[PDB]
Design a protein around this ligand. Structure first.
Ligand SMILES: CN(C)Cc1c[nH]c2c(CCCO)cccc12
Length: 121
């Protein structure tokens, strides 16, 4: 769920999910259109695609468990939707940590009309 995703992000990056990553670029948050603006936005695109592979799961509301094994994220065994949702989120949080150095505040509150183009998962 958003509750676990949020905590994972803050743990990884030191930033709070809302509003560092809920209105960034074309894909972090609401958006699902155009070309991702930078590497952080591409993490959100791949995260959305990840969720798109689970049409019968409910990643916003279904809760899973995960633990830290010295830093490393380990998804705990739950239902199969929970395990797969956790893997999507874990990947995104790592993707965000890996691109913290190019995160730009110019992409916060990014306007819709500037999200132009096509990109298939
Ligand atoms: C639901 N609302 C209350 C908050 C919210 C919507 N989308 C979010 C994403 C998606 C970014 C990753 O693709 C990350 C963190 C929080 C949110």
């Amino acid at each position: 769920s958003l509750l676990e995703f949020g905590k994972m992000i803050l743990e990884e990056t030191g930033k709070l999910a809302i509003p560092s990553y809920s209105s960034y670029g074309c894909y972090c948050g609401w958006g699902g259109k155009g070309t991702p603006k930078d590497a952080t936005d591409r993490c959100c695109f791949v995260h959305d695609c990840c969720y798109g592979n689970l049409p019968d799961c409910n990643p916003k509301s279904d809760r899973y468990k995960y633990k830290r094994v010295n830093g490393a994220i380990v998804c705990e065994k739950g239902t199969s939707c929970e395990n797969r949702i956790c893997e999507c989120d874990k990947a995104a949080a790592i993707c965000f940590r890996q691109n913290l150095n190019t995160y730009s505040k110019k992409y916060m509150l990014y306007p819709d009309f500037l999200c132009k183009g096509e990109l298939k998962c």
